[PDB]
Amino acid sequence: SNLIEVFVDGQSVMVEPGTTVLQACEKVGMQIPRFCYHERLSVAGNCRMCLVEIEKAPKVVAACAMPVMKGWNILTNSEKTKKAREGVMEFLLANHPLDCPICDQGGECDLQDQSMMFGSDRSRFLEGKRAVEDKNIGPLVKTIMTRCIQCTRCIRFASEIAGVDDLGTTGRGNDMQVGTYIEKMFMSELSGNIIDICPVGALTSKPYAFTARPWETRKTESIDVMDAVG
Amino acid sequence: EDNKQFFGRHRWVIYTTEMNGKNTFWDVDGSMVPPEWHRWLHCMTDDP
């Protein structure tokens, strides 16, 4: 076998060559916080929440894109890893609008859950927040671009899985916006899946709008019959 | 009002005899007080 030995918090584990740090931590049973990573999408590595500390290495590395080396000791609960997570949460929540009661992602928001778990508990942002103009992409997806965190799962899904290539990032710096840049609707046969992959309440389901809340719903596992895929 | 009395008896109300077409000469009710006087009567504030 060609497996290499790495260490997560001092515990040894064999991994295939080319395995990332995040995949090794998932193998040992630890879920590194992530925003832009998705196991069915290409690696972007821009949200910088998966930053973890390798022992005897004076720089945190993005675990979603860093391949493991032989003898690496990954410290997922170290002090500077938590410091990096808190700083990235502060930067992510600096410009987010106070929209949680009027947002459909409330109660199942990834940003809320990781802010509660790995983030801090108060804000130092004394300035004014930005505001982004809303877009229209059809009567299926309700769009509130002010809540977007520029994770670029939109473009990766529309370019690699849907095969549409109609979404993109226009602008530069803090004015970078995700959209189609023109009055165009994103109508594919797999469009609504973007509502599943948005970690924030930027893209929500328009028929489901303002109807229920995730904590009060009962889940029944069933099989679709709209086609023969099952 | 009568500030010489002790706390509880220092403010009181004499109800009207007719309120909303109902003869309340004997049938006085505790809910006949409007809210703006309900705040003063229940000692939630000093200012009438």
Binding site: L93, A94, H96, P97, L98, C100, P101, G106, G107, Q112, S115, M116, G119, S120, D121, R122, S123, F125, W215 | -
Partner: protein, 360 residues
């Protein structure tokens, strides 16, 4: 005319409280403890709050610690007035019941001016207290407690030296020191039998080690010594109240960990991190680390303990409530042996029994 066997049948107030706690979060389970002992409302909140704070590995701020002890001693005055005047009401001395209930009404104003409800405050919460004292509240507490030593003396004049009251209580329900420990007795039942034990002196909590008070110790274990111990505890509760008013420190009222205690409404509507925490704490609640603990405080009835089990989620796995009145009622058959039918109603009176906590 004698009594040879006593069989108290309970379950007439079994609401099944501790099963309903398992289906609710830690904040939602707080008002359940108000309705267990409905004359010691803020004392049962403190026992539950100290158990959750022990599992959360957090501590309340120093100002909130002094408010809990100050309102704990006001609660002790509430229970002892009820436990003595209604004990005389069942015996037949109905007149001091009405005198002391006017003072009981004035302390109900202190509860409602600080929490909003007269009886079930839901004020003491895990992490501190919900709201700060309003301005001018401690001036009224000083005015009330200044004249309260006269009110105990009027009740003491009617009962302590009265020969009819002594004849109903001199040699009724005598329990030994060795049998009081084995029967699970606590509080005045141990204290009236000459056993030197008090949870506020031996296993102290928040600021009870910084105040000075005395522990009345009985000598014969009868109904009269337990009556005198309960009256003396009202005098000592005034002594702690005067110390709490003069030693109240400035500061905050909740633990500054915003992931446990909710933030202020001013910063909830301004900063994003506070709105997320306000959203999650009032819907899911704070997650308590796994473990089990048994935290007991000196309730006015006796030792009120809560055995709390957490499984790492936001809801308790098991919340056992130990009440002082449950073990005291078990010894009713032993204490009433060889006594008359009318002597039994004094024994159920000399044990301050509230059936909300006996049946839970």
């Amino acid at each position: 005319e004698m009594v040879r066997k006593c069989d108290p049948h309970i379950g007439l107030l079994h609401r099944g409280t501790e099963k309903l706690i398992e289906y609710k979060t830690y904040l939602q389970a707080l008002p359940y403890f108000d309705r267990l002992d409905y004359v010691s409302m803020m004392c049962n909140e403190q026992a539950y709050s100290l158990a959750v704070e022990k599992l959360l590995n957090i501590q309340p701020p120093p100002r909130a610690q002094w408010i809990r002890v100050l309102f704990g001693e006001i609660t002790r005055l509430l229970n002892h007035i009820m436990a003595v005047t209604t004990h005389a009401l069942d015996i037949g001395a109905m007149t001091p019941f009405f005198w002391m209930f006017e003072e009981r009404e004035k302390m109900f104003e202190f509860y409602e001016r600080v929490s909003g409800a007269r009886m079930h405050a839901a004020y003491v919460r895990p992490g501190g207290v919900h709201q700060d004292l309003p301005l001018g509240l401690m001036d009224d507490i000083y005015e009330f407690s200044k004249n309260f030593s006269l009110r105990i003396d009027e009740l003491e004049e009617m009962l302590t030296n009265n020969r009819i009251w002594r004849n109903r209580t001199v040699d009724i329900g005598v329990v030994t020191a060795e049998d009081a420990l084995n029967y699970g007795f606590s509080g005045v039942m141990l204290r009236g039998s000459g056993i030197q034990w008090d949870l506020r002196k031996t296993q102290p909590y928040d600021v009870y080690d910084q105040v000075e008070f005395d522990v009345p110790i009985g000598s014969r274990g009868d109904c009269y010594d337990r009556y005198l111990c309960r009256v003396e505890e009202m005098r000592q509760s005034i002594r702690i109240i005067s110390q709490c008013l003069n030693k109240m420190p400035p500061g905050e009222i909740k633990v500054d960990d915003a992931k446990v205690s909710p933030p202020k409404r001013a910063e909830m509507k301004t900063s994003m991190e506070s709105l997320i925490h306000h959203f999650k704490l009032y819907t899911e609640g704070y997650q308590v680390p796994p473990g089990a603990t048994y935290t007991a405080i000196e309730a006015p009835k006796g030792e009120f303990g809560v055995y709390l089990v957490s499984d790492g989620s936001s809801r308790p796995y098991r919340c056992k409530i130990k009440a002082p009145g449950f073990a005291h009622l078990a010894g009713l058959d032993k204490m009433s042996k060889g006594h008359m039918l009318a002597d039994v109603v004094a024994i159920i009176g000399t044990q301050d029994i509230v059936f909300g906590e006996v049946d839970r």
